[PDB]
Amino acid sequence: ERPFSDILTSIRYWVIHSITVPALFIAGWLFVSTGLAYDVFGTPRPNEYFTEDRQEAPLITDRFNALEQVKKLSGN
Amino acid sequence: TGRIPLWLVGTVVGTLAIGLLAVFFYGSYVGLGSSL
Amino acid sequence: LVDERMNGDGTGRPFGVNDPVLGWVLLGVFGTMWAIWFIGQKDLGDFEDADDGLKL
Amino acid sequence: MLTLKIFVYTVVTFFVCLFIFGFLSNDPARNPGKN
Amino acid sequence: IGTYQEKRTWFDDADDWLRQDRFVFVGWSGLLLFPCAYFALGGWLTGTTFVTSWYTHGLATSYLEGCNFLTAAVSTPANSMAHSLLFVWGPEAQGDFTRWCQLGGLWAFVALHGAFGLIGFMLRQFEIARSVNLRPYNAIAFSAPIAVFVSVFLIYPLGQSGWFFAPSFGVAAIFRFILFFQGFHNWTLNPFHMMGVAGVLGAALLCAIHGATVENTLFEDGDGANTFRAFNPTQAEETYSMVTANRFWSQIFGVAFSNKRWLHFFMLLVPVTGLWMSAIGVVGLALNLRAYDFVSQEIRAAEDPEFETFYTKNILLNEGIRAWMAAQDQPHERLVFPEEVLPRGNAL
Amino acid sequence: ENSSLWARFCEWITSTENRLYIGWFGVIMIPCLLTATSVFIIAFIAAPPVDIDGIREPVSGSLLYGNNIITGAVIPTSNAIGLHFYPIWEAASLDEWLYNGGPYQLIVCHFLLGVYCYMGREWELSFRLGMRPWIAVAYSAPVAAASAVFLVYPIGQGSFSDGMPLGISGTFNFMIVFQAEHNILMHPFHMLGVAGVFGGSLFSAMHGSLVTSSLIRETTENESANEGYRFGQEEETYNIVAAHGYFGRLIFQYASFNNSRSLHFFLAAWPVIGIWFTALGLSTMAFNLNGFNFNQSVVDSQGRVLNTWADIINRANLGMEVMHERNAHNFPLDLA
Amino acid sequence: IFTVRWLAIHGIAVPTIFFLGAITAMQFIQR
Amino acid sequence: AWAAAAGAAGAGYGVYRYEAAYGAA
Amino acid sequence: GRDQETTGFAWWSGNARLINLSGKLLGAHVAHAGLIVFWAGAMNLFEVSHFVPEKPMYEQGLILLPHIATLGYGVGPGGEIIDTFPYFVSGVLHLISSAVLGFGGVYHSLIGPETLEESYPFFGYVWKDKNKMTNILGYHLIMLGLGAWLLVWKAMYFGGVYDTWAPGGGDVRVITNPTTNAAVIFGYLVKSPFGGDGWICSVDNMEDIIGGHIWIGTLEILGGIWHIYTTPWPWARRAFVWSGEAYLSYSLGAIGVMGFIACCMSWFNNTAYPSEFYGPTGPEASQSQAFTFLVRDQRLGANVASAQGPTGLGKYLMRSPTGEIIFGGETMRFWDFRGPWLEPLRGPNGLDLNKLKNDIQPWQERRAAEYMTHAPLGSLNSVGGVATEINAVNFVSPRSWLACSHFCLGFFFFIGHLWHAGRARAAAAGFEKGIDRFDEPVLSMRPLD
Ligand SMILES: CCCCCCCCCCCCCCCCCC(=O)OC[C@H](CO[C@@H]1O[C@H](CO[C@H]2O[C@H](CO)[C@H](O)[C@H](O)[C@H]2O)[C@H](O)[C@H](O)[C@H]1O)OC(=O)CCCCCCCCCCCCCCCCC
Ligand code: CLA
Ligand code: CLA
Ligand code: CLA
Ligand code: CLA
Ligand SMILES: CC1=C(/C=C/C(C)=C/C=C/C(C)=C/C=C/C=C(C)/C=C/C=C(C)/C=C/C2=C(C)CCCC2(C)C)C(C)(C)CCC1
Ligand SMILES: CC1=C(/C=C/C(C)=C/C=C/C(C)=C/C=C/C=C(C)/C=C/C=C(C)/C=C/C2=C(C)CCCC2(C)C)C(C)(C)CCC1
Ligand SMILES: CC1=C(\C=C/C(C)=C/C=C/C(C)=C/C=C/C=C(C)/C=C/C=C(C)/C=C/C2=C(C)CCCC2(C)C)C(C)(C)CCC1
Ligand code: OEX
Ligand SMILES: [Cl-]
Ligand SMILES: [Cl-]
Ligand SMILES: [Fe+2]
Known part of the structure; x- marks a missing residue:
C-alpha cells in the first residue's frame, strides 16, 4: 500500500504540503531574521566579533574556567 | 492517485529546487561572504 | 665556437629535416612499404562495386 | 648525431607505415562476426 | 522456537517487532544506529549552519557567519580543553547549551554519536545478514572505514595534545588537516599512506575495469540496442562471457582473472587492506612517529651543499607549511613570527 | 603461395593466437613502450644529475647518485629548454643531453604515445574477439590523467620542467607545488575525482562483498570457497537476488540495483567519469584557471576580515609558494 | 499517520525545510 | 527480424529471449 | 515521437x-x-x-x-x-x-x-x-x-x-x-x-x-x-x-x-x-613582468646587463639556449615569445640592450605593465x-x-x-x-x- 507514486500524485498530499511546507520555510526564515539564531547558538552578529577590550581573535586558554571566560570574551 | 501528473510535479518541484539553488549562488556574491 | 651542433632546435623545418637524406628516408621508407602493400593488395579483397565496405 | 637521427627516422617511419597501411589492408573485415 | 517450546517473554515480542520486514529495517542495531546517526548528521548540519568557531579557533565556520558549503565546518574544541569529552553536563559546559556550542562541544557531539553510529551501522549489517542468512562480508569490509574513522578522529587526537588537532567536520576543514599532515608529518612519505593510496586508487581501478569488462563481454540476450533490458535477476546463467573476458585481458595485460569468486574477493580485499594499512600510519602519527626523514640523505645534503633531490625539496616545502600556517593554525601557542624569521625563497 | 608477404604479415599482426596480442596499435605501442621502459630503468638507476630548474644547479634522481626507491626519480627536462623539442641528436654531446633533462622528454614522448596505443589495442582485441568496444573508453580516464600531468600541464605552464617527475618523491613535490599555485583541493573537478576514487573504492568493496557474501555452497570448510567456481562454467555462482535483497534492507529497497548489467555499468561509470573530471581539472589549471579562492571572503561590520578554513589553507598555500623553486624567481609574480 | 516510514522521511524532511528557510534568509543578511 | 532503428535487424528473438523459462525481464 | x-x-x-x-x-x-x-x-x-x-x-x-x-x-x-x-x-x-x-x-x-x-x-x-x-x-x-x-x-x-x-x-x-x-x-x-x-x-x-x-x-x-x-x-x-x-x-x-x-x-x-x-598570453604576461622590472630598475640606477642574479645567470638579461639575449628569471622558458610591444626592442642577436637602455618607449611600458597585472x-x-x-x-x-x-x-x-x-x-x-x-x-x- 502507498508505494511513493500514488502519494506525490494525490491531491490530498498537496492540500497538506502547500500549507505546512511554506509555513515551515517561513518558520526557518523567522528563526534567523528575528535574530534568534544568534542567541540560541551563540554565534556572534557581524557587529559582535570585536569588542573594545580586544581587537584580536579570542583564545579560550583555560579548561575548567572556560564557561565564565567565554562570557568575558564575547562581551555578553 | 494520479490527481496531478507526476511529470508536472517533477518539473515544478525541480524548478524551485534549481530556483532555490540560484538564490544560493546569488547570495554567494552579495551580503555575507561576498568579500566586499 | 666550442662544440658542434645540429642547430635545429627552434627552426621549424618541414618534418624536422635539415640534411636532404632525411627527406629520402621519409620517402624511401614510405615508398618501400607502400610498394609492399600495393603488391600485397591482391589478398585484401577487390572491393570494386559500390556497396562493398563494412557498412550498416 | 646525424647518424642517430637518420636511424630513428628509418625506424619511426617503418612503424608508422606499418600502422597506416595495416588499417588500409582491410582491417574492418578482420572480425569474427559474419553478416 | 528453540525446538524445546518455552513460553515467549517480552523479549520475543520485542525481537519480532524490531526484526520486521517493513520499509526501513530497524532491528536491534537500530536502537543504536538511528538515534546516533541522526544526531551526527543533525549535529553536523546544525553546526555548519549556525554554530560559530570564533572562540575555539578564531575563525568563522557557519553559513550564518558568511561561509559556504566548502568553508563551513563543525570545528574542534580549543587546545585548552585537552581531551575533555565536553559533555553538556561537563565541567566546562555545565548545562549551558549556548556556551557548549561556543566551546566546540558540538564537535564531540558529532564525533561520539558518529562513532557509535558506525558501530550501529556495522551491527546493522551483521543483523541483516543473519536475517537473510548470508555471509557477513559486507560488515567485514566496513571495518576499514571504521579503521579510518577511529584512527583519525579518535586515536590521532588522543596521542596529540588535544581534540584540537582532530579533523573538523567540513570540506575546507578536512583540507587543512590534509595540509597539516604534509607540513608537519610528511605523511605522503609514510609507507602506510603509500599502501593506502595503492589500495584506494587500486580499488578505483578494479571498480572501473570489472564494470567495463562485464559491460563489454555481455551475451546477446536481447534484440534491441538497450542491453540493460536483457536481464532477469532470477536467471541461472552468467550474463557476460567470463571466457571472453579472460582471453581479452590475458592478451592485453598478460594476466587475467579466471576465477569469478577470486575476482570479487580481490575487489573486496584491495580497499580494505589499503585502509587498514593507512590507519596504522595515522596511529603512528598520533605519537609523531613520522616517516619524516631519510637520515642518510640529510647527512649527505648537510655535508654537501650541492646535493639536491626531490626529497630535499619536499623537506624545504614542509618548512614553508610549518612556519606560515602555525601563527594562525595553532592560536593556542600564541606565537608571533616577525616576517624576517619565516623561511622565504628568492623574490616571493 | 597465393598470399603475399604483406598478407602473411597482416594475418600475424592481427592474430588472436599470439600470447600477447599485437594488433596494428601494437606495432606502435611495443617499440614505444620498450623504448621508454629501457630508458626509464637506465635513467632511474644511472642518470647523472639534472638541471631541472634551469638555474644551473643539478638535481640528483638516480640510485647510483645517492637515492633510494622513494626519493629516486627521472628528473623533468630543464626550464631553459621549456617546451622546445630536445632529442638526443639536437645535443652536442650525450652528456649535455643528460645534463639538461633529455631522458625525461624521451620517456614522456614514448610513454604518452604508447598509452594512446595501449588504448587503441584494447579496442582492437575487443573487435577481434567479437566484444563490445568500450573497455578502451574506460581506460581513456587514466590516459587523460597521464596526458594531463606529462603533456597538457607542461603545455599550459610553458615548460616540461613543470611536468610530473618520474618517481615517488618527485610526484609528491609535483602535488605540493600544484596546490600552492592552483589550489587543486578547492577545485570541484578534483573534488569529483576524489569522489570517483572514494566512491570507486566504496563500490569496489560494496560490489565485492555482496557477491562474496552470496556464494552458493559448493565446497567444504577444508577448501577455499574460490574452488567452487569453475572457469568456463555456464551457471552463475552467486545469488544476485540475495545480494540485491540484502542491500535493499540495508538502506532502501529502490536504492539498489536489481539489474546486474545496470549495476556493472554504474560500477564502471562512477570512477571513469570522476577521473575524467580530475583529468580536466588538472588541464584547466594547466591554463591557470585555478581552484576556488575564498580568501578574505567573510568580512564583518567595520570592514574587517574574519578568517575561515580557506584562509588557513591559504597560509599553508603561501608557505609552499614562497619556498618552491626557491632560487628561480627574480620577480615577485610566479607567472610561470 | 504515525508509522515508521512516516517518521523516517519527516525526521529528515521537516528540519531540511526549516534550515532551507534559514539558509535562504542568510543570503539576504547584508552585514 | 524487425529491423531496429540503427539498422542491424534483430537475430530472431525479441527482448530478453529467456522470458519463456523465467517469465519476466 | x-x-x-x-x-x-x-x-x-x-x-x-x-x-x-x-x-x-x-x-x-x-x-x-x-x-x-x-x-x-x-x-x-x-x-x-x-x-x-x-x-x-x-x-x-x-x-x-x-x-x-x-x-x-x-x-x-x-x-x-x-x-x-x-x-x-x-x-x-x-x-x-x-x-x-x-x-x-x-x-x-x-x-x-x-x-x-x-x-x-x-x-x-x-x-x-x-x-x-x-x-x-x-x-x-x-x-x-x-x-x-x-x-x-x-x-x-x-x-x-x-x-x-x-x-x-x-x-x-x-x-x-x-x-x-x-x-x-x-x-x-x-x-x-x-x-x-x-x-x-x-x-x-x-x-x-x-x-x-x-x-x-x-x-x-x-x-x-x-x-x-x-x-x-x-x-x-x-x-x-x-x-x-x-x-x-x-x-x-x-x-x-x-x-x-x-x-x-x-x-x-x-x-x-x-x-x-x-x-596577454601566458608567455606575454610573464615576459611583461621581466620587462617591467627591467625598466623600473634602470631608472633606479642599475646596469641591467651586468646585474647578476642569485643563481649567477643574470637577473634581467640572460642568454637563450640557442644564444639569444633574452629576459632572465623563470621566464627563460618563454624566450621564444614575440609581441608587438617587445619586437621593436629586439635586434637580430636576441634583444638589443643598446636599444633597450636608450629607446624604451613610454607606450611600451604602458602596455607591458597592463599585461603584468592581467596575467x-x-x-x-x-x-x-x-x-x-x-x-x-x-x-x-x-x-x-x-x-x-x-x-x-x-x-x-x-x-x-x-x-x-x-x-x-x-x-x-x-x-x-x-x-x-x-x-x-x-x-x-x-x-x-
Ligand atoms: C620532406 C618531404 C617529406 C615526405 C613527404 C610527406 C608528405 C607525403 C604525403 C603524400 C600524399 C600521401 C597520400 C597517399 C595515399 C595512399 C592511399 C592508398 O592506399 O592508395 C591506394 C591506391 C590503390 O591503387 C589501385 O590499386 C589496385 C591494386 O591492384 C592489385 O589488386 C587488384 C585486385 O584488388 C588486381 O588484382 C590488380 O591486378 C593488382 O595489381 C590496382 O592496381 C589499381 O590499378 C590501383 O589504382 O594506390 C594509389 O592509387 C596511388 C597511391 C599514391 C602514390 C603513392 C606513392 C608513394 C611514394 C612513391 C615514391 C617512392 C620513392 C622510393 C625511393 C626509393 C629510393 C630510396
Ligand atoms: C571535410 C573535409 C573532407 C573530408 C571528410 C574528406 C573525405 C574523404 N576524402 Mg576528400 N578532400 C577534401 C576534404 C575532405 N575529404 C579537400 C578539401 C580536398 C582537396 C585538397 C580533398 C581531396 C581528396 C582527394 C583527391 C581524395 C579524397 C578522398 C577522400 C576519402 C578518403 C580520405 C582518406 O582516407 O584520407 C586518408 C589520408 C591519408 C592516408 C594521408 C595521410 C595522413 C597523415 C596524417 C599525414 C598527412 C600529411 C599532410 C601533409 C597533413 C599534415 C598536417 C596534419 C598532421 C594535420 C574521404 C571520402 C579520396 C577519395 O576516395 O575520394 C574520391 C581521394 O582520392 N579527398
Ligand atoms: C556532435 C556530437 C555527437 C552526436 C551527434 C552524438 C549522437 C549520438 N550519441 Mg554520442 N557522444 C558524443 C557526441 C555526439 N553524440 C560525445 C562527445 C560523447 C562523449 C561524452 C558521446 C557519448 C555517447 C554515449 C555514451 C552514447 C551516445 C549516444 C548517442 C546517440 C543518442 C544520444 C542521445 O539521445 O542523447 C541523449 C542525451 C542525454 C541523455 C543527456 C546527456 C547530457 C550530459 C549529462 C551532458 C550535459 C551537458 C553538460 C553541460 C556538459 C558538461 C561537460 C562540459 C564540462 C564540457 C546519438 C547517435 C548513445 C547511443 O545510442 O549510442 C549510439 C550512447 O549510449 N553518445
Ligand atoms: C564554451 C564556451 C564558453 C566560454 C569560454 C565562456 C566563458 C565565459 N563566460 Mg560564457 N556562456 C557559455 C559558454 C562559454 N562561456 C554558454 C554555453 C552560456 C549559456 C549558458 C554562457 C553564458 C554566459 C553568461 C550569461 C555569462 C557568461 C560569462 C562568462 C565568463 C565567466 C564564466 C564563469 O564565471 O564561469 C564559471 C565557471 C563555471 C560555470 C563552470 C562550468 C562547468 C560546467 C557547469 C560543467 C560542470 C560539470 C557538471 C558535473 C556537468 C553538469 C551536468 C550533470 C549535472 C548531469 C567567461 C568569459 C559571464 C560574463 O563574464 O559575462 C560578461 C556571464 O555573465 N557566459
Ligand atoms: C539539440 C537538442 C535536440 C534536438 C534538436 C532533438 C530533436 C528531436 N528529438 Mg531528441 N533528445 C534530446 C535533444 C534533442 N532532440 C535530448 C537531450 C534527449 C534526452 C532527454 C532527447 C531524447 C529524445 C527521445 C527519447 C526521442 C527524441 C526524438 C526527437 C525528434 C522528435 C521530436 C518530437 O517528436 O518531439 C515532440 C515534442 C514536442 C513537440 C514538445 C515541444 C518541444 C518544441 C519542439 C520546443 C520548441 C521551442 C522553440 C522555442 C520553438 C521555436 C519556434 C520557431 C518558430 C522560433 C526530434 C528531431 C524522438 C525521435 O527519435 O523521433 C523519432 C524520440 O523518441 N529525443
Ligand atoms: C587557414 C590558415 C592556414 C592554412 C591552413 C591549411 C592550408 C590547412 C590545411 C590542412 C590540411 C591539408 C590538413 C590535413 C589533415 C589531414 C589529416 C589530419 C589526415 C588524417 C588521416 C586519417 C584520419 C587517416 C586515418 C586512417 C589511416 C591511419 C589510414 C587510412 C584509413 C584510416 C582512417 C584508418 C595557415 C596555417 C597557413 C595560416 C593560419 C590560417
Ligand atoms: C525538436 C525538439 C527539441 C529542440 C528544439 C529546438 C532546439 C528549437 C530551437 C529553437 C530556436 C533556435 C528558437 C529561436 C527562436 C528565436 C527567436 C524567437 C528570436 C527572436 C528575436 C528577437 C525577439 C530579438 C529581439 C531584439 C532585437 C531585435 C534587438 C533588441 C534586443 C531584442 C532582444 C529585444 C527539444 C530539445 C526541445 C526536445 C525534442 C523536440
Ligand atoms: C544538534 C543537536 C540537537 C538538535 C537538533 C537536531 C539534531 C537537528 C537536526 C537537524 C537536521 C537533520 C537538519 C537537516 C538539514 C538539511 C539540510 C540543511 C539540507 C540542505 C540541502 C540542500 C541545501 C540541497 C541542495 C540541493 C542539492 C545540492 C542537491 C539537490 C538539489 C538542491 C539544489 C536542492 C540535539 C537536541 C539532538 C542535541 C544537541 C545537538
Ligand atoms: O616550473 Mn615547476 O613551478 Ca609553474 O610557477 Mn614558476 O614555473 Mn616553476 O615556479 Mn612556480
Ligand atoms: Cl621546489
Ligand atoms: Cl622570475
Ligand atoms: Fe560482478
Missing part, C-alpha cells in the same frame, strides 16, 4: 532513434544550428549590454566581442573601441536568423516528413550510399570554402581586419598582399608542434593568415567539386565503416583535434587573437591572481576561459570519437548487442593464447 520497443533505444539514447529517419534528423540539425546562432546572438548582445568603455575588453569577460574586434569592426588604433553598434548588428542578425533556423528545425522535427527519401530524392540519403555521402560532403566543403573567402574578402576588400603588428601600432589594416606561397603556407602544417615551432599556433602575421585562407578556400571549393563528381575509391571502401554513426565518429575525432588546436591557439597566439582584445591566472570564481591571493580584483582572462573550455570540449569529443568509432565498427560487424552465446568466437580459439 517514438518509444523504446519500436526502436530498441531508451529515452537516454533517443536521438539514436532518428538515425535512419532523414527528415527528422534534418530538423534535429537545423534546430541545433538555431541554438548555435541563438547563443551567438544572445551572448553577443549580453556582451554589448555589459560592455563598459572605461575598462579593457579582456577585463570584462568578453569572448565574442574580441572576435568581431579582430575583424576590425568598431576598433581604433591601439585597440581603442570606437563604437559598439557594429557589435550590436552582429548580435541581432544572429538573434533574428536563429528564429528562421529555429522554425525549420521545429518544422522538420514535427510536421515535415520522417524520411525524405521517396518524396524528395535530391535530399534523400542512405548512409551506405557512398556516392550520396560524398555528394553531401562536397556541398558543405563549397560552403566552407566560400565561407573562408568571406574572411579574405573582408580583409582584402571590405575594410580590412585588425593587424596587431601594424607599423604605428595595431589598427585595422587592409591586407593588400596575402601570402600565397605554398612553401610558406604549407610550411606551418609540416612544422613541429613543439617550442620554437608551435605547428600553426605561431602564425605571426595577418598576411599568412589571410593568404592561408585563400588556400583553404580554393582547396575546399576544389575538394567539394572533387567529391561531387567522384565516389570513394576501392581502397577507401576497404578502410572505412560506411554507417551513419561511423560518419559521426569520423567527425568527432576530427573536431576533437580542432578543439585542442584552438585551445593552444588562443593560449599562445597573439596575432589571430590580439592581446588588445583577448589580453591569465585567476580562480574559478574569477578572483584574479595566483592561488595565494586575496579577493581584490575580478578577472579571469578570456584566453584562460577559451583554452580551458576548449580543452574540455576537445577532450570529450575525443571520447565521443572513441565511443562511436568503437560502436559503429562493432555494430557494422554485428556484435554490438553482445556475444551470440551460440558461436562465441573465443570458444573456437586455441587455449594458452
